[PDB]
PDB file of C-alpha atoms and ligand atoms in Angstrom:
ATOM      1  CA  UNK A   1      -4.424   2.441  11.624  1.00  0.00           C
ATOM      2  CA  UNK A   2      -7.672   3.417  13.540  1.00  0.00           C
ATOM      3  CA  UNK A   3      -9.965   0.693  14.390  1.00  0.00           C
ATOM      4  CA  UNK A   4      -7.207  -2.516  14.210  1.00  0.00           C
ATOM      5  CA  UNK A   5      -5.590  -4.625  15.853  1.00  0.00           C
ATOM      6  CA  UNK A   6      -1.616  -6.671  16.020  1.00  0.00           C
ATOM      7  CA  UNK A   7      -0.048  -8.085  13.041  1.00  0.00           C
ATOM      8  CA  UNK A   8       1.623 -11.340  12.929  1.00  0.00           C
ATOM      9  CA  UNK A   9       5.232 -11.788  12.445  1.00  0.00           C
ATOM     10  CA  UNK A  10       6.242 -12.040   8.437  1.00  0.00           C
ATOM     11  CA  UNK A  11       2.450 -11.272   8.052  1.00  0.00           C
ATOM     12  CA  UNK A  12       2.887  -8.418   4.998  1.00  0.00           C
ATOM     13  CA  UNK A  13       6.766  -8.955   4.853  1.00  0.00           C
ATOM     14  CA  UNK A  14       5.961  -6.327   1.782  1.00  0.00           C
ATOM     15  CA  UNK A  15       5.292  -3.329   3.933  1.00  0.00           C
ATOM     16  CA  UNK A  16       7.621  -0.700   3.522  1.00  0.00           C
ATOM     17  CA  UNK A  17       8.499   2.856   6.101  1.00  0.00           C
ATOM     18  CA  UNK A  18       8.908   5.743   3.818  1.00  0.00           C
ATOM     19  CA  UNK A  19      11.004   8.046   6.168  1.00  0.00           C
ATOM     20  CA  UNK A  20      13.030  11.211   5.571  1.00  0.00           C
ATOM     21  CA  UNK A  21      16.707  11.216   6.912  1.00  0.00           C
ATOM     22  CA  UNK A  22      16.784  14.812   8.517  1.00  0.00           C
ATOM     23  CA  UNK A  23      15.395  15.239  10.536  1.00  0.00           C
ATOM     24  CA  UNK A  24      14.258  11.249  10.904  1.00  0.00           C
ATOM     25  CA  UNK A  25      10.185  11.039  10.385  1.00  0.00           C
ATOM     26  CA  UNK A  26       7.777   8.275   8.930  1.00  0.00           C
ATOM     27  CA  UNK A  27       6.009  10.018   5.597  1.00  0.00           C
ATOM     28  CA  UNK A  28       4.413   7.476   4.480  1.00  0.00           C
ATOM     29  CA  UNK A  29       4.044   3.452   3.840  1.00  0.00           C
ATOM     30  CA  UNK A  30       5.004   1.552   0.660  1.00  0.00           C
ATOM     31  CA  UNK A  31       4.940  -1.825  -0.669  1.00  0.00           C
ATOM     32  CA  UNK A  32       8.083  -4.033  -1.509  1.00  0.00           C
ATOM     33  CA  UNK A  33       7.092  -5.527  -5.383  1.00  0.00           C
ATOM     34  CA  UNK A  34      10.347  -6.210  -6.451  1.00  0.00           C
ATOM     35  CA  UNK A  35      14.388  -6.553  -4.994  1.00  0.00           C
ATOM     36  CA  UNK A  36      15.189  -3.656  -6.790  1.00  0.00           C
ATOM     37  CA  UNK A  37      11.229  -1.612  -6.625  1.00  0.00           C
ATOM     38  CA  UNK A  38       9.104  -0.302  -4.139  1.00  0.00           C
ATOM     39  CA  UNK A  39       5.792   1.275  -4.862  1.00  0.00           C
ATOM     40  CA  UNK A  40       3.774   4.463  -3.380  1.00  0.00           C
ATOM     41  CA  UNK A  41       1.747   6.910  -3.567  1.00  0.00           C
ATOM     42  CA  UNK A  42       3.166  10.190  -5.643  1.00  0.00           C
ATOM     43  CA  UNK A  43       1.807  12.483  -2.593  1.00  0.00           C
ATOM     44  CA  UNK A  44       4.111  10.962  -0.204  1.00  0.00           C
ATOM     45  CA  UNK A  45       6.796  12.616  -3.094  1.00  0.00           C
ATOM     46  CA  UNK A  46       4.940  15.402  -4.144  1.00  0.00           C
ATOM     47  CA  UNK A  47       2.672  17.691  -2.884  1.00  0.00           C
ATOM     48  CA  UNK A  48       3.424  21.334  -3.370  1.00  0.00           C
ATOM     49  CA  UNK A  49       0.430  22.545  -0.595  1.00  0.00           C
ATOM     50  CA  UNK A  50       2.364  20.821   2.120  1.00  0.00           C
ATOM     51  CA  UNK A  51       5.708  21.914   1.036  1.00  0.00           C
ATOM     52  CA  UNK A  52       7.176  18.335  -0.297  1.00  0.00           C
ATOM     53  CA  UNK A  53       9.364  17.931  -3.759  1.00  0.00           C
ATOM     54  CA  UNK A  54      11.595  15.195  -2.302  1.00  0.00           C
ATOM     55  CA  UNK A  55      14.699  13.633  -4.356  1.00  0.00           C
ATOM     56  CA  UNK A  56      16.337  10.155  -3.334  1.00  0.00           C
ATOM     57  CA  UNK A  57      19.303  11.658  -1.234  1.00  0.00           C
ATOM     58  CA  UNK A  58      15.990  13.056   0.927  1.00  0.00           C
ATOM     59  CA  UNK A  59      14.850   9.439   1.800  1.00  0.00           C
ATOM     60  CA  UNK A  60      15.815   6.103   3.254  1.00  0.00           C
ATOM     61  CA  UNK A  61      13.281   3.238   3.720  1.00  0.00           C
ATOM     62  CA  UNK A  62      12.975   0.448   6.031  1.00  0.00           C
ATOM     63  CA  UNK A  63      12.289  -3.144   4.879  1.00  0.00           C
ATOM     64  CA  UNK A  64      10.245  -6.168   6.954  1.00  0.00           C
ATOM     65  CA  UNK A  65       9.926  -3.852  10.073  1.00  0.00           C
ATOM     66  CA  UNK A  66       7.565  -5.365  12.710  1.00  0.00           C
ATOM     67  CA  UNK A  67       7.806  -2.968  15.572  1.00  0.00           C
ATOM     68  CA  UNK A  68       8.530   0.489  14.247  1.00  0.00           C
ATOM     69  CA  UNK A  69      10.649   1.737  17.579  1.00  0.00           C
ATOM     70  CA  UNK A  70      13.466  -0.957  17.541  1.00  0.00           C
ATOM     71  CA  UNK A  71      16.038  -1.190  15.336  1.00  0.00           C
ATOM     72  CA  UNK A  72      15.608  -5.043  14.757  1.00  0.00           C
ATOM     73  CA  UNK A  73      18.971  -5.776  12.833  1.00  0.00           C
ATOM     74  CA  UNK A  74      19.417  -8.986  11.152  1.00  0.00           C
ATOM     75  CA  UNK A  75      15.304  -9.367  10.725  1.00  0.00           C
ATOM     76  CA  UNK A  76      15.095  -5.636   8.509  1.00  0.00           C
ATOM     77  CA  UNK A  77      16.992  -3.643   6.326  1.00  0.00           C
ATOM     78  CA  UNK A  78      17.588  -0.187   5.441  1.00  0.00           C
ATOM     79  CA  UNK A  79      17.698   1.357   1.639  1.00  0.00           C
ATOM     80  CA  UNK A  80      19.137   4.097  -0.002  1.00  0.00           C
ATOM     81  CA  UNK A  81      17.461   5.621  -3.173  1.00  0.00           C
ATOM     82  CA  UNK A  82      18.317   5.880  -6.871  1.00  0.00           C
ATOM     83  CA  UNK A  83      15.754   7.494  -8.681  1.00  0.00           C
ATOM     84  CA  UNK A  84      12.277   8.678  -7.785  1.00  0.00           C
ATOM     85  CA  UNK A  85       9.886   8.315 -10.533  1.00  0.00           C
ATOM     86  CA  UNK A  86       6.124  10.144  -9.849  1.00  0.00           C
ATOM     87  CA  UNK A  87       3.429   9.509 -12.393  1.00  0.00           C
ATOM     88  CA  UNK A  88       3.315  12.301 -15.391  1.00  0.00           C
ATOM     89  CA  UNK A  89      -0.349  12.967 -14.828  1.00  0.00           C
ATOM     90  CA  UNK A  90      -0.156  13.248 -11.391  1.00  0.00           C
ATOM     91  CA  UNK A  91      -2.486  15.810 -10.486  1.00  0.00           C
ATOM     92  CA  UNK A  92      -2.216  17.094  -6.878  1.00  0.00           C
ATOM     93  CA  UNK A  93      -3.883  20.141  -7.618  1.00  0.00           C
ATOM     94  CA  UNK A  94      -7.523  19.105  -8.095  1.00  0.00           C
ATOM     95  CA  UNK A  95      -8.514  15.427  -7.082  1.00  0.00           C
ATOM     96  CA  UNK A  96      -5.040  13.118  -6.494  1.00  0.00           C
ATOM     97  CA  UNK A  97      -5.612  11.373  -9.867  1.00  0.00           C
ATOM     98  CA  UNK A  98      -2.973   8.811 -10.965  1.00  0.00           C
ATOM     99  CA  UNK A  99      -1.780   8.840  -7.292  1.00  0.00           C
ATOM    100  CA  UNK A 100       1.262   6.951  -7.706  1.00  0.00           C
ATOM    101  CA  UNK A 101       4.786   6.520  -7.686  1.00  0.00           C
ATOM    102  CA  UNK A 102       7.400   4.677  -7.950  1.00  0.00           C
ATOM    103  CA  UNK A 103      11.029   4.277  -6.080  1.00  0.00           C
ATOM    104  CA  UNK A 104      14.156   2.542  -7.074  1.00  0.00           C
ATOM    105  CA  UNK A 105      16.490   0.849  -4.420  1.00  0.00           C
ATOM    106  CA  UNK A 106      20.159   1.543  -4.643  1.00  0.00           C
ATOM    107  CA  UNK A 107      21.110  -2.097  -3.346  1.00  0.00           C
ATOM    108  CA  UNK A 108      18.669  -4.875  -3.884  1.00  0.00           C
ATOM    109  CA  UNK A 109      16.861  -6.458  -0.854  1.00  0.00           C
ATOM    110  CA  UNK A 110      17.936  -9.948  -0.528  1.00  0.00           C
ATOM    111  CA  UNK A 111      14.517 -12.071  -0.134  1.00  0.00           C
ATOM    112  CA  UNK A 112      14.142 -13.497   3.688  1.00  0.00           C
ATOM    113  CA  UNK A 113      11.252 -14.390   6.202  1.00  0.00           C
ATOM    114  CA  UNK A 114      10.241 -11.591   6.835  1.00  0.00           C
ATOM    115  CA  UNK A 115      11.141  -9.520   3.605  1.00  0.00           C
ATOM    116  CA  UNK A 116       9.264 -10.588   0.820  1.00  0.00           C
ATOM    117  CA  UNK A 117       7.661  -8.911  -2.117  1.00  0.00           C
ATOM    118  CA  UNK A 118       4.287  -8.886  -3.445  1.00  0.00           C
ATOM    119  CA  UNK A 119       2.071  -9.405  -7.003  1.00  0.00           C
ATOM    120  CA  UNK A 120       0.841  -6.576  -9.042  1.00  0.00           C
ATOM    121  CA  UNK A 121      -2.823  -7.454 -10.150  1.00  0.00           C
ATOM    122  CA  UNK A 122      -3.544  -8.603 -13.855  1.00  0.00           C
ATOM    123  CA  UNK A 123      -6.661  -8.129 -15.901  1.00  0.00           C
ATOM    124  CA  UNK A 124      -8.624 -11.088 -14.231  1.00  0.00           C
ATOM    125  CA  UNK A 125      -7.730 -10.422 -10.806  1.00  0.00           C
ATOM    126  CA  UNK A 126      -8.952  -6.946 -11.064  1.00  0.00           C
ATOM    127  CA  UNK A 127     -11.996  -7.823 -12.565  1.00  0.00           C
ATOM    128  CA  UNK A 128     -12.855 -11.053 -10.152  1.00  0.00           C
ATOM    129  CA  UNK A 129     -11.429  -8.936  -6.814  1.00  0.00           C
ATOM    130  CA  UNK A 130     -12.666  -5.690  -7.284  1.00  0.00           C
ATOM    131  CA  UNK A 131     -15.882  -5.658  -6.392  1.00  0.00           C
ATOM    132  CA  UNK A 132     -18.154  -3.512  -3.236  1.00  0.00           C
ATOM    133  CA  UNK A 133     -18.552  -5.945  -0.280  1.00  0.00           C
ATOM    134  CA  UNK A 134     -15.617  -8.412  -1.085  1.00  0.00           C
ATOM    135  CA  UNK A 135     -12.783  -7.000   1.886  1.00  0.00           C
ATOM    136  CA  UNK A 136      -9.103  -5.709   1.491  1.00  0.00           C
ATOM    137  CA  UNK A 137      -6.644  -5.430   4.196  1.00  0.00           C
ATOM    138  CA  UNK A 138      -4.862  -2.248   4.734  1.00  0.00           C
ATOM    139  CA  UNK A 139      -1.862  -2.370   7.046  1.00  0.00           C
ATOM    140  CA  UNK A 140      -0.138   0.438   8.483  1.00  0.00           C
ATOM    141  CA  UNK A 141       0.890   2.159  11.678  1.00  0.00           C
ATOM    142  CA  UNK A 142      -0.574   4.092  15.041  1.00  0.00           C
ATOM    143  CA  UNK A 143       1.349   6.934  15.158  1.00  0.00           C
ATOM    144  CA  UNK A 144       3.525   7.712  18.356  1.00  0.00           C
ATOM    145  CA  UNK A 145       1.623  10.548  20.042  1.00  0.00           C
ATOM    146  CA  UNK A 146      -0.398   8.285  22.622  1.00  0.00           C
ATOM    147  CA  UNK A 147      -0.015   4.669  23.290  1.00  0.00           C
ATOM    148  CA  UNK A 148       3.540  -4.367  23.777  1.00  0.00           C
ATOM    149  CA  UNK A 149       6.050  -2.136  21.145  1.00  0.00           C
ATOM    150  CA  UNK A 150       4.759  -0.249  18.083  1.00  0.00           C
ATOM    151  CA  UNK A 151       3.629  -3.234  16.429  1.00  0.00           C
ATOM    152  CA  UNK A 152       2.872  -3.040  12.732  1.00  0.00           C
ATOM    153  CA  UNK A 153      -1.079  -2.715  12.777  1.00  0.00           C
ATOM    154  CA  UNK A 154      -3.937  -4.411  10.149  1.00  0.00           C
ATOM    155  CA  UNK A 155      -7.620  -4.431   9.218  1.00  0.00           C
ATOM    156  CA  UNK A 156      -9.849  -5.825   6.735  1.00  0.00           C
ATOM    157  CA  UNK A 157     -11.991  -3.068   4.663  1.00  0.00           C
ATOM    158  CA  UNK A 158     -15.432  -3.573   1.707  1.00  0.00           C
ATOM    159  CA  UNK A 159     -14.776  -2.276  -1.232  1.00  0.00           C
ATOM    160  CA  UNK A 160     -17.781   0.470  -1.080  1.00  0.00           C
ATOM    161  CA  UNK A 161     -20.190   0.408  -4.534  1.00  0.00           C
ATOM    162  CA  UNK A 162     -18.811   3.263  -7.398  1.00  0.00           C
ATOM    163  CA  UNK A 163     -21.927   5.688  -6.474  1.00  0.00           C
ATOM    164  CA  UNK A 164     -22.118   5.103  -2.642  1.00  0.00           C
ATOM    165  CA  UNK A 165     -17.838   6.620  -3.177  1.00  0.00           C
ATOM    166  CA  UNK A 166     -19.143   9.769  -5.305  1.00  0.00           C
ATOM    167  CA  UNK A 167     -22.348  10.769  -3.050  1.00  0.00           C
ATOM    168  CA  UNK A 168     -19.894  10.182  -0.163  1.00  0.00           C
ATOM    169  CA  UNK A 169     -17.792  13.410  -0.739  1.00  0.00           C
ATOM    170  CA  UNK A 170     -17.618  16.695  -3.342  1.00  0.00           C
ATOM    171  CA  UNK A 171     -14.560  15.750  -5.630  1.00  0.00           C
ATOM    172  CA  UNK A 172     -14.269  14.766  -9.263  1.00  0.00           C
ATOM    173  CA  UNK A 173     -13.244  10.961  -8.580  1.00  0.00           C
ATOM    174  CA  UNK A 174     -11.873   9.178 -11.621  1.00  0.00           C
ATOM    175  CA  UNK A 175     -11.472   5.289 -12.561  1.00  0.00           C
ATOM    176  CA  UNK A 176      -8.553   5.545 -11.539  1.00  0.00           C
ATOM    177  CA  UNK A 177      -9.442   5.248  -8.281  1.00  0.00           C
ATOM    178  CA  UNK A 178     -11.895   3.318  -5.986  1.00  0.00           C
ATOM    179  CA  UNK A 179     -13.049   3.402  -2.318  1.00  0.00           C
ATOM    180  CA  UNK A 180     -13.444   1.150   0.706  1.00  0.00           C
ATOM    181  CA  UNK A 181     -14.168   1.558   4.351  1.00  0.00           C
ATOM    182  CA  UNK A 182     -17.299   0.627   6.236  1.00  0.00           C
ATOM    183  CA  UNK A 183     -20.598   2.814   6.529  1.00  0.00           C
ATOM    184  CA  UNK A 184     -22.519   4.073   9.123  1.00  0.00           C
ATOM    185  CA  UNK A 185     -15.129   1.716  10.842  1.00  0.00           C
ATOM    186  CA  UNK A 186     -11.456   2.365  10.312  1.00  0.00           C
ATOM    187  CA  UNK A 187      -9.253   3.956   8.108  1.00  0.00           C
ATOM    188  CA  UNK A 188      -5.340   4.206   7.375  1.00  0.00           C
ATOM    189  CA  UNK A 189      -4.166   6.756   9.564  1.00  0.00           C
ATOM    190  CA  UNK A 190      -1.096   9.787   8.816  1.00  0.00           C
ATOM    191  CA  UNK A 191       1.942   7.437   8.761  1.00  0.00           C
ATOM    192  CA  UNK A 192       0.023   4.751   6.456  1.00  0.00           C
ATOM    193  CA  UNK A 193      -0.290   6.727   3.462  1.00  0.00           C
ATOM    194  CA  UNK A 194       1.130   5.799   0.344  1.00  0.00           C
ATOM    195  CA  UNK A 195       1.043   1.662   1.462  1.00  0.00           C
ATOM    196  CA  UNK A 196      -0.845  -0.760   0.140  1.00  0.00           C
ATOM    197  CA  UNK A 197      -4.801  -2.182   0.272  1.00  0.00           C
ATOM    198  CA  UNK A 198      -4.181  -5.990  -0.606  1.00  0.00           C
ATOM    199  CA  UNK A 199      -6.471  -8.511  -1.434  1.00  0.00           C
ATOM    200  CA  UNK A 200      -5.986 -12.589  -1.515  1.00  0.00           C
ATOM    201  CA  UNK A 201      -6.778 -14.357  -4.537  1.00  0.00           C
ATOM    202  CA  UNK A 202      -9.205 -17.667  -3.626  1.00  0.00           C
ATOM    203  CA  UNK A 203      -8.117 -19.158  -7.153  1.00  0.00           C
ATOM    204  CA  UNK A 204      -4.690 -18.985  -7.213  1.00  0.00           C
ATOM    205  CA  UNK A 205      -3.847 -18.543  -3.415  1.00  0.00           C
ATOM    206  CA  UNK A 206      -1.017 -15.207  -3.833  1.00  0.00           C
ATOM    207  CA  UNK A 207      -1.767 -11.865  -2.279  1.00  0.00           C
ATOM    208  CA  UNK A 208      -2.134  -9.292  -4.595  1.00  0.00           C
ATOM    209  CA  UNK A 209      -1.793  -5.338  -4.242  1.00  0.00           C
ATOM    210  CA  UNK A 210      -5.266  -3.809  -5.332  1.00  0.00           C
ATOM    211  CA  UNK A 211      -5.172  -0.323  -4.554  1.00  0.00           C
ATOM    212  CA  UNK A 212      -2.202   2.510  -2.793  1.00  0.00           C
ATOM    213  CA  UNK A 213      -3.980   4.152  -0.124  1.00  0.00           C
ATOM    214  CA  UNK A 214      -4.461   7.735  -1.595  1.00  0.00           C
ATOM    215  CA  UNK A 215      -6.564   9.547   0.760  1.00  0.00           C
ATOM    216  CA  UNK A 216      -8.788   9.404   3.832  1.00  0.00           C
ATOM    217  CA  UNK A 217     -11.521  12.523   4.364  1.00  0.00           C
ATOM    218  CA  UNK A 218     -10.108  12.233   8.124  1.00  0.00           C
ATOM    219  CA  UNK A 219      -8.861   9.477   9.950  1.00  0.00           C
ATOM    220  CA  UNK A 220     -12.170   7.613  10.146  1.00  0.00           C
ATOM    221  CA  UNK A 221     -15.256   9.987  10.337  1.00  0.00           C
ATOM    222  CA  UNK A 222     -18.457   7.848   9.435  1.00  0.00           C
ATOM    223  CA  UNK A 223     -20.400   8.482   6.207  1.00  0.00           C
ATOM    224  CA  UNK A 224     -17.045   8.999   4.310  1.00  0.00           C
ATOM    225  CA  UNK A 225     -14.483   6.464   2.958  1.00  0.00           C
ATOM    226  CA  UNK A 226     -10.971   6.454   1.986  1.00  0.00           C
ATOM    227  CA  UNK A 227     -10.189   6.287  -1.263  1.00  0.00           C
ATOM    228  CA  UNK A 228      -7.526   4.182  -2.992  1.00  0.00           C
ATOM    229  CA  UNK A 229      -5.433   4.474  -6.113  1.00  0.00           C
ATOM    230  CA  UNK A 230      -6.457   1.738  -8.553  1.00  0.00           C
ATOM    231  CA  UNK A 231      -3.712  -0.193  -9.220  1.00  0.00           C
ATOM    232  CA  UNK A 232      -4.226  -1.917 -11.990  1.00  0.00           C
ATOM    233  CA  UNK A 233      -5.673   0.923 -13.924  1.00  0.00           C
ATOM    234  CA  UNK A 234      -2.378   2.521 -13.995  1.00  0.00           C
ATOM    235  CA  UNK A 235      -0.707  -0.877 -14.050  1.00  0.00           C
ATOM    236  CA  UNK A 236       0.376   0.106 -17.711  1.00  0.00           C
ATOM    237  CA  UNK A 237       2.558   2.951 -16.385  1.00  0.00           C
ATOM    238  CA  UNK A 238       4.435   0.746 -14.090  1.00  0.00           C
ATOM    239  CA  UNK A 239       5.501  -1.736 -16.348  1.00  0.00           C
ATOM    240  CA  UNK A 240       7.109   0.666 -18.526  1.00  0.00           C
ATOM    241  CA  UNK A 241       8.866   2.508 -15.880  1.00  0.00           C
ATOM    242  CA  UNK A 242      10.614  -1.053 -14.713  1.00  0.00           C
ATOM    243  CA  UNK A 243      11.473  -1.761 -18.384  1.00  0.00           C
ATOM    244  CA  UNK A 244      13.190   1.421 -18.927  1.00  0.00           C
ATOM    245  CA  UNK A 245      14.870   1.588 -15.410  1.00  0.00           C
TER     246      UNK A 245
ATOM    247  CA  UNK B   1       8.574  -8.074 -16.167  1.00  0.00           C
ATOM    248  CA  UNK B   2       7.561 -10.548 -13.745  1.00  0.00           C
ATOM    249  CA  UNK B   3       8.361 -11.883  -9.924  1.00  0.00           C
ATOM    250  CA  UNK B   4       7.705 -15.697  -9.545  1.00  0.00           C
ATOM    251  CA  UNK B   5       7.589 -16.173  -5.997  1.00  0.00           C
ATOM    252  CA  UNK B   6       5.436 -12.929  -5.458  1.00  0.00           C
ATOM    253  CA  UNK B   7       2.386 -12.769  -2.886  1.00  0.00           C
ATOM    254  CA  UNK B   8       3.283 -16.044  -1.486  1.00  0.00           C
ATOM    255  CA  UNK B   9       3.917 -15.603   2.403  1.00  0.00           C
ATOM    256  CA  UNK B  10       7.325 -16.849   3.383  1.00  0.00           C
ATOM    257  CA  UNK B  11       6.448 -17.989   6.803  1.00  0.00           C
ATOM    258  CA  UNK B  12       2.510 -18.688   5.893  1.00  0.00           C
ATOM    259  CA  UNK B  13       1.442 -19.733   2.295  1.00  0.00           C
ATOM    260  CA  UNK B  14       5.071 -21.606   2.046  1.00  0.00           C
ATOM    261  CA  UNK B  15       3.879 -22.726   5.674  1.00  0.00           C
ATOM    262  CA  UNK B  16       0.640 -23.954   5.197  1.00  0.00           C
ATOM    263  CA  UNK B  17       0.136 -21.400   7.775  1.00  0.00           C
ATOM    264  CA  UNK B  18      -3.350 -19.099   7.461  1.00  0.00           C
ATOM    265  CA  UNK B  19      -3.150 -16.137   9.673  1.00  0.00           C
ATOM    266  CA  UNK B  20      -6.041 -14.572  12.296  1.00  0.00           C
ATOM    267  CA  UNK B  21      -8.317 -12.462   9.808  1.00  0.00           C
ATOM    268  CA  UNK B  22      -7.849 -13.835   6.288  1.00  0.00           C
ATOM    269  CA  UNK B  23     -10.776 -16.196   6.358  1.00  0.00           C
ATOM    270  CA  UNK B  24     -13.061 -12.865   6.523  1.00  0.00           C
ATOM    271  CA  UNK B  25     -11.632 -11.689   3.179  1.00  0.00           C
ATOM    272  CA  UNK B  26     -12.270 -15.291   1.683  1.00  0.00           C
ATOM    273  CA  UNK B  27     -15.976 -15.919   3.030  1.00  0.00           C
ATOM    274  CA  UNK B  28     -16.503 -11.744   2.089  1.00  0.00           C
ATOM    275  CA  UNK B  29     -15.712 -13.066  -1.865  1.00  0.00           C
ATOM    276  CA  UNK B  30     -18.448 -16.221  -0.828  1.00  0.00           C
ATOM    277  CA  UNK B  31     -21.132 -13.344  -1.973  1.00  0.00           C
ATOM    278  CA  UNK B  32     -21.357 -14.326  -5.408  1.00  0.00           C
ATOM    279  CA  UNK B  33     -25.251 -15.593  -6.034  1.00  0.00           C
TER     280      UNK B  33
HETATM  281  C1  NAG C 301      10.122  20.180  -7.797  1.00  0.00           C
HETATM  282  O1  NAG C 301      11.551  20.067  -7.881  1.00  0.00           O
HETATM  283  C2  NAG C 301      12.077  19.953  -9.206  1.00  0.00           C
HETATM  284  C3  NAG C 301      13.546  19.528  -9.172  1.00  0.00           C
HETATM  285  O2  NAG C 301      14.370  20.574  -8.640  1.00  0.00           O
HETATM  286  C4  NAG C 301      11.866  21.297  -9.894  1.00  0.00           C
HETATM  287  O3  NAG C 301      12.440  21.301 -11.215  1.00  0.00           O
HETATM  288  C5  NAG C 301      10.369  21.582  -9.961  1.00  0.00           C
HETATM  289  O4  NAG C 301      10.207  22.936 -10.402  1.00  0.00           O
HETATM  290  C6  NAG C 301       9.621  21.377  -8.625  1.00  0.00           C
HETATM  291  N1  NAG C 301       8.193  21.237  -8.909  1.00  0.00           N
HETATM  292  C7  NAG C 301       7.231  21.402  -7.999  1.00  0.00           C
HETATM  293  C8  NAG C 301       5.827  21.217  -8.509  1.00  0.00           C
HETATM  294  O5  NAG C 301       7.463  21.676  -6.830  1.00  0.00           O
END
């Protein structure tokens, strides 16, 4: 993430590494909602320009990692895939609507410390949460290239007002998705795709997955925002996924 | 279906336990004149 700063330990035991097995390289971030589910974005799956169709033999994905380098065995895991299942209306071509997916563990993650999952937003939640000014933290992770381990990064981001998110760039945005990011700084670098923007419910006390980080316009270039799949928009979709299996 | 435990922090809402930057997310939802 640009503009952060050092998670805690067991801090969003949700995060997830999307990585490919050969050659080994982090895709993309996910969140951990279930012992059996883990959810994404479908352009960390899909995305025909950039020469990605994965299947689940492709991928492996590492649970409750706090420093990225190590291989910290007996705090993470490691997880094989069953099925991949991208939304049906997933359009890559023109805008990244319905930017979401969804990926099924082979084994089930046994609940720990530092491995735990997290709550998919309800009617009220979105309603009370989503709104421009209240914050959401996105966490993710500085890539490699430059730069005390690789410590899973974090920062706190305002929800930026519907019309401020269309006069801020050229493309047909839907409901689907909303925007956050401060204004004339930081956004979810290459590595943090796909992961999650969370928010913390004052009523009820949980954390609770708002929006999938979809896009960024660059990783942060003032006077544009990243944008974020709307969660519970396409909340609908999930649920009938996980009931069918 | 439905997760019970969900969004509740093993090692800080189990703990009692509020982290470095999560009272600027509450006191950003205080804006509500
Ligand atoms: C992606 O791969 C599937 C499975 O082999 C194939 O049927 C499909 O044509 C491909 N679609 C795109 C958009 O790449």
């Amino acid at each position: 993430i640009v503009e952060g700063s050092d998670a805690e330990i067991g801090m969003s035991p949700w995060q997830v590494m999307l990585f490919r097995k050969s050659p080994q390289e982090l895709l993309c971030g996910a969140s951990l909602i279930s012992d059996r589910w883990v959810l994404t974005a479908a352009h960390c799956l899909l995305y025909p320009p950039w020469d990605k169709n994965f299947t689940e033999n492709d991928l492996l994905v590492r649970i409750g990692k706090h420093s990225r380098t190590r291989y910290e065995r007996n705090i993470e895991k490691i997880s094989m895939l069953e099925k991949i299942y991208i939304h049906p209306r997933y359009n890559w071509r023109e805008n990244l609507d319905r930017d979401i997916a969804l990926m099924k563990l082979k084994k089930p993650v046994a609940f720990s410390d530092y491995i735990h999952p997290v709550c998919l937003p309800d009617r009220e939640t979105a309603a009370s949460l989503l709104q421009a000014g209240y914050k959401g933290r996105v966490t993710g992770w500085g890539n490699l290239k430059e730069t005390q381990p690789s410590v899973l990064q974090v920062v706190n981001l305002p929800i930026v007002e519907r019309p401020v998110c269309k006069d801020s760039t050229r493309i047909r945005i839907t409901d689907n998705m909303f925007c956050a990011g401060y204004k004339p700084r930081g956004d979810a670098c290459e590595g943090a795709s796909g992961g999650p923007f969370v928010m913390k419910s004052p009523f009820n006390n949980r954390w609770y997955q708002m929006g999938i980080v979809s896009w960024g316009e660059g990783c942060d270039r003032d006077g544009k925002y990243g944008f974020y799949t709307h969660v519970f928009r396409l909340k609908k979709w999930i649920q009938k996924v996980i009931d069918q299996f | 279906s439905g997760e019970a435990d969900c969004g509740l922090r093993p090692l800080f809402e189990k703990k009692s336990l509020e982290d470095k930057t999560e009272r600027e997310l509450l006191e950003s939802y205080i804006d509500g004149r």
